[PDB]
From a paper:
The T2SS containing XcpQ is responsible for the secretion of at least 19 substrates, most of them hydrolases ranging from proteases to hemolytic lipases that are critical for pathogenesis. In the T2SS secretins, each subunit consists of four N domains followed by the highly conserved secretin domain (Pfam PF00263), followed by an S domain.
At 3.6-Å resolution, individual α-helices and β-strands were resolved throughout the upper part of the secretin structure and within the N3 domain, and the majority of the protein could be visualized. Less well resolved density was present for the N1 domains, and no density for the N0 domains could be observed. The failure to identify these N domains raises the prospect that this region of the secretin complex, proximal to XcpP in the inner membrane, is not arranged in a uniform 15-fold symmetry. The disposition of the S domain in the XcpQ complex structure is equivalent to that of the other pilotin-dependent secretins. Structural comparisons with the Klebsiella-type secretin complex revealed a striking structural homology despite the differences in their sequence characteristics. The flexibility with which the features pack in order to transition from 15-fold to pseudo-6-fold symmetry provides insight into the mechanism for substrate entry into the T2SS, with the substrate-XcpP interactions competing for the XcpQ-XcpP interactions in order to gain entry into the XcpQ chamber; success in this competition would see the substrate be secreted via pseudopilus movements.
Numbering used by the authors:
A (entry chain G): 433 to 440, 454 to 576
B (entry chain H): 529 to 593, 604 to 613
C (entry chain H): 337 to 440, 454 to 480
D (entry chain G): 337 to 384
């Protein structure tokens, strides 16, 4: 999609969704150079504040410059995000007893993983046969 | 570590009934934080292929943990 | 991360005779005896405003309120961004939302979430420089 | 991506006599005993 966004009301148009911008530089042979600007946006209906569209305009946005080989599936980027959180609330004498400690406390656990890889694959074609 | 009290000034001091008059509020708090870094230099495509194969197997095993069997690509 | 509170208080409401009433109001932990004798009038019409793990031993005027709570929260975050780059090439990973913020209303877009910007400088050998 | 919450709490409302009532209000997981004794009055008119 293409959405508006306020810059004041003096709103402006702005693109949201999967996107890719490559710029190569090609040797006569192996080992091409790439200038990648890849991104994945989104748009969020759930967590809305007292304000406008909470546009996830980057959810991944890797703007890198790599140098690859013409048949090699390589890895450009990644994110491994792990989380574990836990709150309690108890009567300070009675929650401790490990026989009735469930009957007084109040627990809240939260585990969270986000694994993310961004791979790239270049193929060099110079004759129309391979194309 | 922080701790506030509020008591009747004669009766909270007695270490037999001092709990029965005062009002305490304790607060302990820790935040540990490290930021580490790891560089790996690759200059031939062999080591880049090795890194790619290790990360690709390490994401395949996350695929290996409905949620049916995920797929390889043209490696 | 982690934290632990521990709030505990004994309150005495001996209203043995006379105008007044020998109540030991401690406005430290949530409720109090003053709002408890107003909570008598709450128990009349509204029955409002509790707070904390309360225990009320009273002969309905001769009172003793014990209020206690023990919060205990822990947390454990981990993150591993990782990217490939050449030297002298500003790479970037940005994961997570893009929000507005007021600069007046003349709002502006701004990125929120895990992020990394590396710039190397590479010797022919060991001991790379990173920014 | 993935996440898992786990929220669980026991609340005790022993109002055995006296002005007060020995209720163990834990305002952690949703409802509470204070809003439960107000939910008695909700069960009277609104039930909310």
């Amino acid at each position: 999609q293409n959405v508006p966004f306020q810059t004041g009301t003096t709103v402006e148009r702005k693109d949201i969704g999967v996107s890719l911008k490559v710029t190569p530089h090609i040797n006569d042979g192996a080992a091409l150079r790439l200038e990648i600007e890849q991104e994945i946006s989104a748009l969020l209906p759930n967590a809305q504040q007292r304000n406008n569209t909470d546009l996830i305009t980057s959810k991944r946005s890797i703007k890198s410059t790599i140098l690859a080989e013409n048949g090699q599936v390589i890895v450009i980027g990644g994110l491994i995000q792990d989380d574990v959180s836990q709150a309690e609330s108890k009567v300070p004498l009675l929650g401790d007893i490990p026989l009735l400690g469930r009957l007084f406390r109040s627990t809240k656990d939260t585990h969270t993983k986000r694994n993310l890889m961004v791979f790239l694959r270049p193929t060099v074609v110079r004759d129309s046969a391979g194309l | 570590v922080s701790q506030a009290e509020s008591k009747v000034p004669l009766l909270g001091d007695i270490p037999l009934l001092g709990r029965l008059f005062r009002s305490t509020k304790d607060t302990h708090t820790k935040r540990n934080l490290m930021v580490f870094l790891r560089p790996t230099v690759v200059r031939d495509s062999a080591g880049l292929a090795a890194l790619s194969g290790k990360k690709y197997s390490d994401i395949r095993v996350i695929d290996g943990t409905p949620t049916n069997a995920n797929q390889l690509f043209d490696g | 991360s982690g934290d632990i509170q521990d709030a505990v208080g004994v309150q005495w409401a001996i209203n043995k005779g006379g105008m007044g009433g020998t109540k030991t109001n401690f406005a430290n932990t949530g409720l109090s005896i003053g709002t408890l004798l107003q909570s008598l009038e709450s128990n009349k019409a509204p029955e409002s405003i509790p707070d904390g793990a309360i225990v009320g031993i009273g002969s309905s005027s001769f009172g003793a309120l014990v209020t206690a709570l023990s919060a205990n929260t822990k947390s454990n975050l981990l993150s591993t961004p990782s990217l490939l780059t050449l030297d002298n090439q500003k790479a970037e990973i940005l994961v997570g939302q893009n929000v507005p913020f007021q600069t007046g209303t003349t709002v502006e877009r701004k990125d929120i979430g895990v992020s990394l910007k590396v710039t190397p400088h590479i010797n022919d050998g060991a001991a790379l420089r990173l920014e």
